[PDB]
Design a protein around this ligand. Sequence first.
Ligand SMILES: CC(C)(O)c1coc(S(=O)(=O)NC(=O)Nc2c3c(cc4c2CCC4)CCC3)c1
Ligand SMILES: Nc1ncnc2c1ncn2[C@@H]1O[C@H](COP(=O)(O)OP(=O)(O)O)[C@@H](O)[C@H]1O
Lengths: 130, 1010, 129
Amino acid sequence: GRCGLSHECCFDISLVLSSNQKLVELDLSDNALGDFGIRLLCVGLKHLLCNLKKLWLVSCCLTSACCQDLASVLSTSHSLTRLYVGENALGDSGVAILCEKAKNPQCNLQKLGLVNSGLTSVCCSALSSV
Amino acid sequence: MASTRCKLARYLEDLEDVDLKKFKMHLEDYPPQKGCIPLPRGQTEKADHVDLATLMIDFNGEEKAWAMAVWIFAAINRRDLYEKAKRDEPKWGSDNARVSNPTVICQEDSIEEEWMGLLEYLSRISICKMKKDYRKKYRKYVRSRFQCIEESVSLNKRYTRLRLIKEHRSQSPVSPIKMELLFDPDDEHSEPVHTVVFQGAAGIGKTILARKMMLDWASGTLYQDRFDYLFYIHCREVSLVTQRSLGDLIMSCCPDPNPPIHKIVRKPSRILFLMDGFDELQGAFDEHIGPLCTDWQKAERGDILLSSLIRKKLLPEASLLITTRPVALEKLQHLLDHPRHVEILGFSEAKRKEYFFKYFSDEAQARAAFSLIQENEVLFTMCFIPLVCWIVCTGLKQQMESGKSLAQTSKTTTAVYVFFLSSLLQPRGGSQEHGLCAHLWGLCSLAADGIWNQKILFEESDLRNHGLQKADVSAFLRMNLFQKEVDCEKFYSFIHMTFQEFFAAMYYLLEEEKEGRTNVPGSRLKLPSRDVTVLLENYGKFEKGYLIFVVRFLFGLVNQERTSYLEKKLSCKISQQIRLELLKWIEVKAKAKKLQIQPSQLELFYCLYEMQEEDFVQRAMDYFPKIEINLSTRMDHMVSSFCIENCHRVESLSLGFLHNMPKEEEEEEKEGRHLDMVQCVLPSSSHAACSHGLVNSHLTSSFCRGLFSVLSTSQSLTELDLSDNSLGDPGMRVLCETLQHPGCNIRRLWLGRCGLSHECCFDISLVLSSNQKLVELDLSDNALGDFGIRLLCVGLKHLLCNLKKLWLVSCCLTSACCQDLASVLSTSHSLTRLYVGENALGDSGVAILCEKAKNPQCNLQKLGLVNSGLTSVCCSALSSVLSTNQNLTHLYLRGNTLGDKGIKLLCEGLLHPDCKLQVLELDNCNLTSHCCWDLSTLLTSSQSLRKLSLGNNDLGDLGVMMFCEVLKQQSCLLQNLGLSEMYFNYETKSALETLQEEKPELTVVFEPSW
Amino acid sequence: LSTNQNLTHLYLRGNTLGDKGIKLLCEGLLHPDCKLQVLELDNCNLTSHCCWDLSTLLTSSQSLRKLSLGNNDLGDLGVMMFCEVLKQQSCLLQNLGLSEMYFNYETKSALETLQEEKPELTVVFEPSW
Ligand SMILES: CC(C)(O)c1coc(S(=O)(=O)NC(=O)Nc2c3c(cc4c2CCC4)CCC3)c1
Ligand SMILES: Nc1ncnc2c1ncn2[C@@H]1O[C@H](COP(=O)(O)OP(=O)(O)O)[C@@H](O)[C@H]1O
C-alpha cells in the first residue's frame, strides 16, 4: 500500500497472483494505478486464485469503468471474502454495475468498503435490492 | 498648416547639434519677453525635436512657442533658421494632444463636461449625420422582409445554435466560432481574409441559416457591430445573360428610388455579401471563363458578374459568405483560394425533440408523436437534416386532423416523401373527377422541365403551359403552402428543390401519364425525354444540378411491393427494364473509372439502401471489392452498415481520413519496390496533440457497434484497412470482440498511423490469440510504447505461428521492448518479416535484437531497421548474426549512421559462405569512398546478394569508378544496384551509360541521371 | 512541324502552354509527313484533359520515339490511358518519362506490371521505387 506503482506493475502483479495461489491477502491501497490495471488484475484474480479473500484498493485513482471489470471477477470469484474499493472515482454510475454482480448466490463476499466514494442517494435504490 | 509643432520640430531638425544645445540652453534661460516662461532644463534636454516643439506649445501656447524659437534662432546665431522663422508664420490651430481632461493655470481649470459636447457639435457637421442616415434605414429595411404572413412568422424563436464544425486547415482546438468572430482568423494568420463557405447536405438549412444570420445582425444584436454592412443575395432571381450590374444586383436587395450606391461604394472589406446556394445557380458555368470583369458598374453577364465577385478581382476587399452543396464544391474550390470551409450538421437526438418544442403546441401532439420516432429508430437515424423533421411533424400533424399515427412506414427517405403525399392527396384526390394524379403528372412535367430547362421560377407564364393556371394549382399552392410569395414580385416557384427532383423521378416511372393520356396544356414540344439513360449520361453535370436526388429517388420509388397497394397508378415492365438499365449504370461505374467528380461509393450505397430486397442490390454490390468510403453521421454509418449486409466474400474495406495512403507499401517477396518512409509533412507534432485531447463526445460506442457487427458477420472477408482513422481504444475493444468471432475470417488487418495505445495492445493481443487466420498486421506510426510490446508478445506466442509480418515503426518504442521482441522471436515459428525501424531502440536495444537471431529456428527473412538511430558499435553484433542465420535475406538501414568502420564489419558479416543475404539498404548511412573498395570485393565474391542501395553517401568519383571494375570482373552477376541524390560532373555519368549498355544482366539504376 | 522535313526534336520544359496549346501540338504532328522523334513537355502546365488527345496521336504516330510530360496535372485517369496505350499494340514507342508528382499505390500499381509486360517501350518513372 501507499507506494507509487502503476499499470505495468499490475500486469506483473496479475502474473504474481496467478503463480502464488498461497497468497491470501493483498493491499494495493493508495497506489495511483487506474482502471487498465484493474482489468489485468481481474484476469489474475480468476486463475488458480479462489484462495484470495481480501483486497485493498482504495485511493488508486480508479474511474467508474473499472466497475465493469470488478463485476465479472466477482461474478465468478469463489472465496473473495472482503473488498475495499472506497475513496476511488466510481460514482453512482460506477456502482450501478457493482450492484448487478451481487445478485447471485455465488457471491461469497462478506464486507464492503465504499467509504468516501462520492456516491449519492440515487445508488441506494440498487444496493437496497442487493 | 494644421500643426505649428510639426513646423517647429522641422526647424529643430534643421538646427545643428551645437545650435540645438545652444537652443536648449536659450529655451531654459529665455528672458521674460511677451509673457514667455522658459522651459525646465530636464524637459528641454530629454525632449527630441518633435517633443521639444510639443513642450514649447504646451508651456506657453503655439504663438509664443514660435516667437520664442525666432528669438532663440537669432540668439544662437542660426541666421538661416531665424530668417526661416520670420519667413514662415504658422496658423495657431493646435496639434494632437492627449489632454482628454482639459487643464488651465486657474484652479477651476476645465473638465470633460458639457463644454466638450458643445465644442464637438460646433465643429462636427457631416460625419455623424451621414453615418446616421446610412445606418437606421439599411438596418430596418433588411429586417422587414422575412415575417408577418396572414409558418414563416417567427424565426429567431426557431434558432437552435445549429452545429458549426469549421473545417480545420486540411494540411485539437475547438473554437466553434458560431456567431462571434466567425469570420475572424486566429492570432493574425490572415487579417484580410474575406471568403467563408458553408458545406451542408441538401435540406440542412443553409438557406435558413443565412436568413437567421441576417435577422440576428439586422438588429446589431451583439453581432459583428465592428462590421458595417451585410448583403443577402439568393440566386433564385439571379440568372444567366441578365447583363445587370452590381448596383442593379445591390438595388435588388433594397430598391432605393435614389440609390446611394456612390456612398455604398465606400470602405471595401467593411461590406459583406451573403451569397446563397451555388446549387441555385441554374445553367452552364465555366469556372475559368475567358472574358474577365473588373468594372463594378458595367452591365455584365450574370455569371461573369459572379465570376469577378467570386474571384474578388472586382471589389478586392469585399467579404463573401457562400452556402454551397458539397457535391458542387470542386467548381468553386478550383475557382477560389483560401476558402473558410464550414461543415454544418442537423439536429441531434435531443435537439430533434427540442425542434418539436419549437414546432408543436401540445405534448399530446408533441410527446406522443415524438415517442413514435424513438421506437422507429430507422426513422430516428433518418431524422437528421432538419428538413425531413419538418416533413415528419407537418405530415403527422395533418394525420392527427383526421386520425391516429402508425409505424409511418418511413423506413427510407422516399418513404417519408410518399407518406407525406398520401396525407396530402386526401380530400379531393380520391374522387376520380377531382383526381389530381393527372395534375400530379402536370406538376411533374413542370418539375422535369425545372432542371431540364433550368427554370425554377416558372411563374404564371409557364404554369399555364403545364396546368390549370388558376383553379387547380391554387389547391396545390395552398397544399404546398409556398409557391409564389418567396419572390414577392410576380414569379411562381416550388417549396424546395428536393420536391422538384422528387417529382422529376416520379414522372419517369409514371410513363408520362402512361402512353394513353397526354392532353398537354399547349405543350406539343419541350417534353424532356422519357428515357432514363440520358439522365445517367448527364449525371454529375452542373448544367443539370448533379442529378443526385433524381437518380437517388428512383431506387426508392421502384419498390414493387410498397407501391403496389400504395399507388396502383404505377409503372410497368418499363420499370423492370429500367432496373436493368440502372443495374448497368452501377455496374459500369465501379469497373470502368474510379476517378470522377463524385459518384461516391457510399453515394451508390445510398441508392442500394433505398432499393430494398436482396438480389438487385446484391448484383450491384458484387461489382466492387474496392470499398473506400468516409462516414460523417449515424445515417452514413447506417447506410454503409446496411448495404454491406448484402453480398459476401468482399475483399477490402477502407475507412477513415485517407485521401492519401502512403507509407504502407507491401513488399511480399522478390519485389522491385519496398516500403519507404513518407511521414507526410504537416502532421508533425499536431498528430500527437490531437491523440490526447480529441474529446469528441459525439463519437461513442455507437456509430461503431452496428458497423462492425457487419464485420463480425464478414462471411469470407479477407482484408480490412483502418489507416489514419481517429479510432481510439474503446472502439478498438469493440473491434477486438468483433475479430474474436469465429466467423470473422479476416486475413489481413491494417491499423497504421492511428492513435492507439497500450490498453488496445491488451485488446489487440487478445485478438491475435483468437483470430489465428490473421496473417499480417500493421501497427506503424501508432504511438503505443513498450508495455504494449510485452502484451502483444504473449499474443504472438499463442495459436499464432501463422503471423508472418508485423509493421511497428514510429510507435515511440524504447530499447526495453527489445528484451520482449527477442523472446517471441526466440520461439516464433513462421514470423517472416519484421518492421521495427524508426523507433528508439538504439545500439543498446539491438544488442538484444542480435542475441535472438543466432538460432536456426529464426524463420525471419526481412528486417526493417531504417532510421533507428543505431551506430557503428552495433555492427559487430549483427555481423555475426548474418552468418549464423540461415533465413534472414533482407536488411533495411537507410538514414541510420554507421560510417565505414561499421560497414567494414558488414563485408565480414557477409564474408561467410553460409550467408543468405539478398537485399541490403545503406542509403543515407553516412558512408565514404573508403569502404566502397571493401564492399565491392564482397560483391564480386558474394553470389547470394541481389540488390544494394548506397545513395546519400560519400561515394566519390574514385569509389563509383570501381563499379566499372566490378563489371570488368565477370563475377558481377548482381541483379540490381541503386545510387542516387549526389551531384557529380560528366565523368560519373560518362562510364555509366556505356557499361549499362554493355551490361543487360545487372539492373544498375542512377536516379538523378538523365 | 508539318512543313519541316528535318526538325526531329523540340524541348519545351518549364514553359507554360496549357492544354489549349498542346491540343494544337497533336494536330501539329497529325500530318504523316512529320519527322518528330523527341519532345519535351515537362513542367508545361498541362492537365489530364489533353492527355487523351496526345495519346491518340502517340498510337497513330510512328515517327516519335520519346516524350516527357512531368510536373503536370496528369491525374490518375490520365496516367491510366497509358495502359490503354499498351493495350493498343500500335504502341511501338521507344521511351516515356514522367516524374515529380506524388500519387498513391494505384498509379504505380499498373506501372510495374505493364513495364514487366512491355520490353519494347522504355517507360521510366523517376519518383518510383
Ligand atoms: C456524402 C454524400 C455524398 O452522400 C452527400 C453529402 O451531401 C449530399 S446531398 O445530396 O447534397 N444532401 C442530402 O442528401 N441530404 C439528405 C440526406 C438524406 C436524406 C435526405 C436528404 C434531403 C432530404 C432527404 C440522408 C443523408 C443525406 C450527399
Ligand atoms: N434551424 C432550423 N430550425 C428549424 N427548421 C429548420 C432549420 N433549418 C432548416 N429547417 C427546415 O429546413 C427547411 C428548409 O431547408 P433549406 O434551408 O432549404 O435547406 P438547404 O438550404 O440545405 O436546402 C425548412 O422547411 C425548415 O423547416
